[PDB]
């Protein structure tokens, strides 16, 4: 097979990781109360 030429690499910088996690964790702090209801 021929190495498909439509692929690029993927990236996530450290700051994005942080901004990401901050969002996941707090949403979790916001919705857990309603999940346990």
């Amino acid at each position: 097979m021929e190495p498909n030429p439509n692929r690029q690499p993927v990236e996530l910088n450290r700051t994005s990781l942080y901004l990401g996690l901050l969002l996941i964790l707090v949403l979790a702090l916001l919705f857990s109360s309603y999940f346990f209801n």
Binding site: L12, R14, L21, A28, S32
Partner: protein
Amino acid sequence: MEVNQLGLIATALFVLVPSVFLIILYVQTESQQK
């Protein structure tokens, strides 16, 4: 108390899954040569 049984797992996977996502990327980014 009288809470929901699935609440714990709903909260656990709600945090783990997407966090595990980001982390997989960040680490694979971080280790890209040059």
